[PDB]
Design a protein around this ligand. Structure first.
Ligand code: 616
Length: 240
């Protein structure tokens, strides 16, 4: 997250760190949202690789013991069937991960609430992106979880020529684009938390940014629109 602030450790308990095995260690690669004690929602682009993954819940600092973490392996991965790795702009950037064990819930570990199917936010709706992604374009990952306020940019504005044009589809949510704040590499797969009727819900799964950089004016961060996938998510959890 570029231009973020450190999140309080109990503000976003559904946020998880998705990591892969690298040598004798684990490397953070993406964010994700805990949706069931044994299921995590992330981006397809985070797991369409030949790696061994684990999820860390109750994670605040990737490099220090927080004393609240639960480390769990990923048992099964279900990527959206229309996903195409070399065509993120087509959409379908979503995947569900079934965990090897069910995690224990507490103030640092909670299920993320998803919007009702079809829900679209009004332009400039208040949301926060969270994650450990780069803190600057071509920079380095954050050690502590960061958050940045990114109000939404509706489909009509987002798909206009000075914004993203037709690269953005109606199955996506755009947010930010102020040139200072944004998601960045390593934030992909994580949540876009939006406040609606007093409660935060995860309306987006971080998917992509501009080729020019993370925080680019009029190139808001783009997310898979969760509300376009409620039936898909329900179908997967039920058949697995
Ligand atoms: C996730 O971290 C994203 C954004 C949110 C930073 C990032 C990831 N790239 S990487 C180097 O961490 O593997 C996954 C894809 N991604 C992108 O920004 C992809 C952008 C690609 N463009 C191609 C042109 C059409 C729009 C998307």
């Amino acid at each position: 997250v570029v231009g973020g602030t450190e999140a309080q450790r109990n503000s976003w308990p559904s946020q998880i760190s998705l990591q892969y095995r690298s040598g004798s260690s684990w490397a953070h690669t993406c964010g994700g949202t805990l949706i069931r004690q044994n299921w995590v929602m992330t981006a397809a682009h985070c797991v369409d690789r030949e790696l061994t993954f684990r999820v860390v819940v109750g994670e605040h600092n990737l490099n220090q013991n927080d004393g609240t973490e639960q480390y769990v392996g990923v048992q099964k991965i279900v990527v959206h069937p229309y996903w195409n790795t070399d065509d993120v702009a087509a959409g379908y950037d979503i995947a569900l991960l079934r965990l090897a064990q069910s995690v224990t819930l507490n103030s640092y570990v909670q299920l993320g609430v998803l919007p009702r199917a079809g829900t679209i936010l009004a332009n400039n709706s208040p949301c926060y992106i969270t994650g450990w992604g780069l803190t600057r374009t071509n920079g380095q990952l954050a050690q502590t979880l960061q958050q940045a306020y990114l109000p939404t940019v509706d489909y009509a504005i987002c798909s206009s020529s000075s914004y993203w044009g037709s690269t953005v589809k109606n199955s996506m949510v755009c947010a930010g684009g102020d040139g200072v704040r944004s998601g960045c590499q390593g934030d992909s797969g994580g949540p876009l938390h939006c406040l609606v009727n007093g409660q935060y819900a995860v309306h987006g799964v971080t998917s992509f940014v501009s080729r020019l950089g993370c925080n680019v004016t009029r190139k808001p961060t783009v997310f898979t629109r969760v509300s376009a996938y409620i039936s898909w998510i329900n179908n997967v959890i039920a058949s697995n």
